[PDB]
Amino acid sequence: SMNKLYIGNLSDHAGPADLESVFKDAKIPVAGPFLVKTGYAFVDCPDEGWALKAIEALSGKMELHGKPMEVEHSVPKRQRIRKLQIRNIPPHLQWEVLDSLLVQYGVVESCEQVNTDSETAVVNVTYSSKDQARQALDKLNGFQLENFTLKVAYIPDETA
RNA sequence: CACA
């Protein structure tokens, strides 16, 4: 399940109370405790929809202790392989346009739309190879398209 | 992005 969050760029004194308040104010229920490490934390959301809401609501927007939080899907390093999620896709971007960006970095084995509350669209992309997805992620992350900037992140690749 |  993609309900597990990574909370990056935390300050040297962000504690679970601080994270609890951020998710409380953002009205993101969490399904377990915040595990705070050194400059980063983890938390589970009740389901995939709530985790994505936290990412879209908080990641790069919410400032804790004068630092913008990163809030992304927690992906084990060894599972950063073929699969990306792409957020902040323009609401009325035709699939063929998105596909013509995607295929510039490899073979797309699958591109699935993810139901989202926001007006932007979200897709999970699976590339043929680890290399293709890393090129997609480096090149598509930050790409500005129809008044929006793509956010591209790994999602777990458990089958490669 | 967890691992004495």
UniProtKB/Swiss-Prot annotation:
It is found in: Nucleus; Cytoplasm; Cytoplasm, P-body; Cytoplasm, Stress granule. It comes from the Eukaryota. Expressed in oocytes, spermatogonia and spermatocytes (at protein level). Residues 3-76, 82-157 form the RRM domain. RNA-binding factor that may recruit target transcripts to cytoplasmic protein-RNA complexes (mRNPs). This transcript 'caging' into mRNPs allows mRNA transport and transient storage. It also modulates the rate and location at which target transcripts encounter the translational apparatus and shields them from endonuclease attacks or microRNA-mediated degradation. Preferentially binds to N6-methyladenosine (m6A)-containing mRNAs and increases their stability. Binds to the 3'-UTR of CD44 mRNA and stabilizes it, hence promotes cell adhesion and invadopodia formation. All KH domains contribute binding to target mRNA. Domains KH3 and KH4 are the major RNA-binding modules, although KH1 and KH2 also contribute. The KH domains are also required for RNA-dependent homo- and heterooligomerization. The integrity of KH domains seems not to be required for localization to stress granules. Belongs to the RRM IMP/VICKZ family. Can form homooligomers and heterooligomers with IGF2BP1 and IGF2BP3 in an RNA-dependent manner. Interacts with IGF2BP1. Interacts with ELAVL1, DHX9, HNRNPU, MATR3 and PABPC1. This is Insulin-like growth factor 2 mRNA-binding protein 3. It comes from Mus musculus (Mouse).
